[PDB]
Write a protein that binds this ligand. Sequence first.
Ligand SMILES: CO[C@@H]1O[C@@H](C)[C@@H](O)[C@@H](O)[C@@H]1O
Ligand SMILES: CO[C@@H]1O[C@@H](C)[C@@H](O)[C@@H](O)[C@@H]1O
Ligand SMILES: [Ca+2]
Ligand SMILES: [Ca+2]
Ligand SMILES: [Ca+2]
Ligand SMILES: [Ca+2]
Lengths: 114, 114, 114, 114
Amino acid sequence: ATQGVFTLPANTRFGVTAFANSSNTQTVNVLVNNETAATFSGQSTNNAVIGTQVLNSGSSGKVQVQVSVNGRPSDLVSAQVILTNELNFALVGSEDGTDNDYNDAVVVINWPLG
Amino acid sequence: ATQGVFTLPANTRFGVTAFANSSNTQTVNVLVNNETAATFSGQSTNNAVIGTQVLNSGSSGKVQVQVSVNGRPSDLVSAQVILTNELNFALVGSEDGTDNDYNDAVVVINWPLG
Amino acid sequence: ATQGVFTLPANTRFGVTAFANSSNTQTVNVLVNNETAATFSGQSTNNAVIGTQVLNSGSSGKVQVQVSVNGRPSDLVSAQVILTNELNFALVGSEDGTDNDYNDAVVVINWPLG
Amino acid sequence: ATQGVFTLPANTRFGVTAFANSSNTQTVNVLVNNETAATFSGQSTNNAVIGTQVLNSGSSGKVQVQVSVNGRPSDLVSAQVILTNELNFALVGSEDGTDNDYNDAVVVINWPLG
Ligand SMILES: CO[C@@H]1O[C@@H](C)[C@@H](O)[C@@H](O)[C@@H]1O
Ligand SMILES: CO[C@@H]1O[C@@H](C)[C@@H](O)[C@@H](O)[C@@H]1O
Ligand SMILES: [Ca+2]
Ligand SMILES: [Ca+2]
Ligand SMILES: [Ca+2]
Ligand SMILES: [Ca+2]
């Protein structure tokens, strides 16, 4: 199944934040309507917040998270959760290796903001 | 129902990170071994990170998040989501007023780390 | 925070299924656009499916689940989760008493169908 | 990533319920500690329940859902959600073709019971 792709409401501000837990440097790309809108990278095994940014979902609302480790795409897992019919989290984990913790880069998208 | 309480595996490292989206200063307390293990405080209307830390879940694994604003307890919402039977997110929203966006402090707990 | 209220896409078929796990008879009502559209009742301590139905979310998309025991409303917990950006579950648990598993009546809504 | 595999608490009863939304007959196998514990088959384009059972998670707590259509394993998507730190849902969708809603068979696992 496709993972790391979320339909947000259009023209809406959202937070995107990436955490690293791997001996390898992670590179996280965030695409809005198929165009790169943010890129984060770092190397930590203790959950460093390698990036965080406010983006606008634009007219399509399409947001896609990709993760790579020196050019090699990682396998993704993802889901969206909604609390009290209002508060939205889109969640991504990624695996660059052999141990299947899926925490090598962890991405959380949240909206609404403000 | 009780909200903002999660049973993690005992004696396990986890990340906790708080974001603010309110005109009011948010105070986030994170309890482990039924004592305050971390306190974050800050104000943003742009999803700023007001705190991030790595903690150990202690003998019981019970982690509780409480949010207050100028001494008033915020109403909480929460859930835990597990991806590929391995990657865990414990999520908290909170409301400090009337508009019911539940984003005034948003708290993300994730594990495993490393 | 409000629980058991979900906004579905308009004019969309969904399934709703109720389980009972209590010594007390559970009454589950499902409302669409603030109108009762399905009712199920029964007593089971073995997860009986006390009812399942296909409904249409209608022009408003508003779906509410209510649970009562002998006319007393039960307290609810709820959340919505989306897999692969397409498969939706709206989840409800309810508590009629003191023991706090919120499993006295459990309701699952799923879409899309067909 | 592996999908449809969940670690439940050991020696705990859980419910499993299966819905179909396809012209192809669906087969759902529920394994406990790598042995078939239940098998459901049926055909519906209207979300009919094709199977429901109460099972015991056994010594390991390992439960696996497998779906097949015409003897071919379907692609799965899955996640576990926990409400109020007590009420558990393990959720599976499956795809037997290309269409990508992952609703051809939908499986819901819930615990605790009783
Ligand atoms: C080389 O393996 C990568 O780094 C290790 C130290 C672990 O974080 C592992 O999960 C990750 O896939
Ligand atoms: C005064 O209200 C508080 O601050 C406003 C700027 C909004 O963030 C609102 O959600 C919050 O409850
Ligand atoms: Ca790894
Ligand atoms: Ca790792
Ligand atoms: Ca607010
Ligand atoms: Ca706010």
